[PDB]
Write an enzyme that holds these catalytic residues in place. Structure first.
Site, mmCIF file in Angstrom:
data_model
loop_
_atom_site.group_PDB
_atom_site.id
_atom_site.type_symbol
_atom_site.label_atom_id
_atom_site.label_comp_id
_atom_site.label_asym_id
_atom_site.label_seq_id
_atom_site.Cartn_x
_atom_site.Cartn_y
_atom_site.Cartn_z
ATOM 1 N N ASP A 1 0.856 -1.180 0.000
ATOM 2 C CA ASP A 1 0.000 0.000 0.000
ATOM 3 C C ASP A 1 0.897 1.237 0.000
ATOM 4 O O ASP A 1 2.068 1.150 0.365
ATOM 5 C CB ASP A 1 -0.941 0.005 1.209
ATOM 6 N N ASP B 1 0.608 4.059 1.689
ATOM 7 C CA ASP B 1 0.661 4.814 2.937
ATOM 8 C C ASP B 1 1.339 4.048 4.066
ATOM 9 O O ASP B 1 1.212 4.412 5.235
ATOM 10 C CB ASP B 1 -0.747 5.226 3.368
ATOM 11 N N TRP C 1 -13.418 -1.941 -0.632
ATOM 12 C CA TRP C 1 -12.437 -2.151 0.428
ATOM 13 C C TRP C 1 -12.608 -3.461 1.201
ATOM 14 O O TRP C 1 -13.723 -3.867 1.532
ATOM 15 C CB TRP C 1 -12.449 -0.974 1.404
ATOM 16 N N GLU D 1 -9.737 -8.818 0.018
ATOM 17 C CA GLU D 1 -8.786 -9.348 -0.955
ATOM 18 C C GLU D 1 -7.568 -9.969 -0.270
ATOM 19 O O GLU D 1 -7.047 -10.992 -0.720
ATOM 20 C CB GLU D 1 -8.381 -8.276 -1.979
ATOM 21 N N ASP D 2 -7.147 -9.369 0.839
ATOM 22 C CA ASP D 2 -6.017 -9.877 1.607
ATOM 23 C C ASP D 2 -6.365 -11.206 2.272
ATOM 24 O O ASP D 2 -5.520 -12.102 2.359
ATOM 25 C CB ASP D 2 -5.571 -8.848 2.649
ATOM 26 N N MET E 1 1.339 4.449 9.427
ATOM 27 C CA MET E 1 0.410 4.692 8.328
ATOM 28 C C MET E 1 0.104 6.185 8.224
ATOM 29 O O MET E 1 -0.062 6.868 9.240
ATOM 30 C CB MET E 1 -0.885 3.900 8.534
ATOM 31 N N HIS F 1 -5.395 9.442 7.111
ATOM 32 C CA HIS F 1 -6.261 9.989 6.068
ATOM 33 C C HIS F 1 -7.726 9.621 6.285
ATOM 34 O O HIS F 1 -8.032 8.593 6.886
ATOM 35 C CB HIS F 1 -5.807 9.498 4.691
ATOM 36 N N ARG G 1 -11.421 8.293 5.098
ATOM 37 C CA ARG G 1 -11.811 7.211 4.190
ATOM 38 C C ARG G 1 -12.282 7.722 2.833
ATOM 39 O O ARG G 1 -12.465 8.925 2.643
ATOM 40 C CB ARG G 1 -12.858 6.294 4.829
#
Ligand SMILES: [Ca+2]
Ligand SMILES: [Ca+2]
Lengths: 122, 273, 123
Positions: free
Chosen positions: B123, B125, B185, B188-189, B215, B218, B220
């Site tokens: 990712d 971030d 979101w 998938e992981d 991280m 931020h 969403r």
């Protein structure tokens, strides 16, 4: 604006070494992951905020406009944890240590109970 | 002509102070890292590394996040003596975000450039706090972001494979790559985790204090609202991994940009069915 | 506001332990993936919204402005699932359990039937 180093911060919390089953190096590990030794670190949330080097929550430890009903245990305004003087930050962190304990900081149990040599300052 | 780089790098310094309070100039980090060749490519001049790593980054509209990533990672990656490349797979459009599909593209698009054998999927971030956290692959799939600050520096669960991971080319091929049917979101992981385990593989991790990660804070995103189909999809990975994956991956390459610090591949990956 | 820990939620879900044949660490695992232990977790879809730690939908279970025709199975405003008390959240969850089963929360099948040993509170 003030950002300590590992050993520089270490000499400042010398009275805390042996403070209630607490090793200074474990506490150094803690603040590194907590705030990175930054006196002006701040984490803003929807209801609460964490202030300074010790990331001290306005929920109950200090006083802010965001949480007016805070117990304000350290009896101080929260953005006094943003001056270059952590002399009062230490006084409040000492209350946290005495009341909640060292596990107020989530990073201690997770990261700072072993491999303490990197955080030793001799 | 050139010797083999050691198992462990001499250049590693350990813990690194990560800050997001200051401004970053991509032009300067470029001059900060002169050894990084156009397209975000670096290989040691001192040694030959066994780690040919393509670093894939799923992306849309986080340029300020991308600045900090390059600012911290390039120096780390160079001190790790990796023969690496930086790929920012950028999703063209305003439709729902598909992290796992962008990763699939990155794998396929990086191979066109060079003979990579490892793939870091990261990712944009997520920044490591210790350069001992190896950004290369192992005998088993590698979870790199195992102690995240947003999780109180603990693994949220032991079957969590989110954030940063490392897969050898053969590990990625054994599981038919990643799924392309997770829109939005989450999930998938977990699905990718299921693919590896069902193929006999297990998750390899650095110890907590090494795999630490900050991280970039931020709000969403509307183009990545939580996928409501995910929990239903995770439960049928064994039956869907054969049909959905690298074999069933289609996309349209709109643009390829060779920046000094990264290679940005703008791609149309479609829409949910 | 409130966001529980694996150990705090453990003490508050006692009266629900074994309800429907679902053990305590099943719940904890389930609600983590479902909401992250956040009591103010709000996810609104096209035509619905899921509320609180249990992510109870306004489509059927609670009284909301967005879904004014809702059957309101749990006799309650959807907004009481956003406070810091999960007393009435649990009583709607018992009711969801009775009617729909554990499969209202699809995270349970996906992620919470293996390796339950991690969701225990240590001490
Ligand atoms: Ca201060
Ligand atoms: Ca409630």
């Amino acid at each position: 604006a003030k950002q300590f180093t590992k050993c520089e911060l270490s000499q400042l919390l010398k009275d805390i070494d042996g403070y209630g089953g607490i090793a200074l190096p474990e506490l150094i590990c803690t603040m590194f992951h907590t705030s990175g030794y930054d006196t002006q670190a701040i984490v803003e949330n929807n209801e609460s905020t964490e202030y300074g080097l010790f990331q001290i929550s306005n929920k109950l430890w200090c006083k802010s406009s965001q949480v007016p009903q805070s117990r304000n245990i350290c009896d101080i305004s929260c953005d006094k944890f943003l001056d270059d003087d952590i002399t009062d930050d230490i006084m409040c962190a000492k209350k946290i240590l005495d009341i909640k304990g060292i596990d107020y900081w989530l990073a201690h149990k997770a990261l700072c109970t072993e491999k303490l040599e990197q955080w030793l300052c001799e | 002509s050139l010797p083999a780089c050691p198992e462990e790098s001499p250049l590693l310094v350990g813990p690194m102070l990560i800050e997001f309070n200051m401004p970053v100039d991509l032009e300067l980090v470029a001059k900060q890292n002169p050894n990084v060749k156009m397209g975000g490519r670096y290989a040691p001049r001192d040694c030959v590394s066994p780690h040919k790593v393509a670093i894939i980054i799923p992306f849309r509209n986080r340029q300020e996040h991308l600045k900090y990533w390059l600012y911290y990672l390039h120096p780390v990656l160079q001190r790790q003596q990796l023969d690496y490349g930086i790929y920012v797979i950028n999703q063209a459009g305003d439709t729902i975000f598909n992290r796992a599909k962008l990763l699939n593209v990155g794998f396929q698009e990086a191979l066109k450039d060079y003979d990579y054998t490892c793939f870091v999927f990261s990712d944009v971030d997520l920044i490591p706090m210790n350069d001992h956290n190896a950004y290369r692959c192992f005998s088993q799939p590698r979870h790199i972001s195992v102690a995240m600050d947003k999780f109180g520096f603990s693994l949220p669960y032991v079957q969590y494979f989110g954030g940063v991971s490392a897969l050898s080319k053969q590990q990625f091929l054994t599981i038919n790559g990643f799924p392309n049917n997770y829109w939005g979101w989450g999930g998938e992981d977990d699905d990718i985790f299921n693919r590896l385990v069902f193929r006999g593989m297990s998750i390899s991790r650095p110890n907590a204090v090494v795999g630490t990660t900050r991280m970039i804070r931020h709000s969403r995103d509307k183009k990545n609202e939580p996928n409501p189909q995910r929990f239903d999809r995770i439960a049928h990975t064994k039956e869907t991994m054969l049909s959905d994956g690298l074999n069933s991956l289609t996309y349209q390459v709109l643009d390829v940009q060779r920046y000094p610090l990264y290679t940005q591949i703008t791609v149309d990956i479609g829409t949910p069915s």
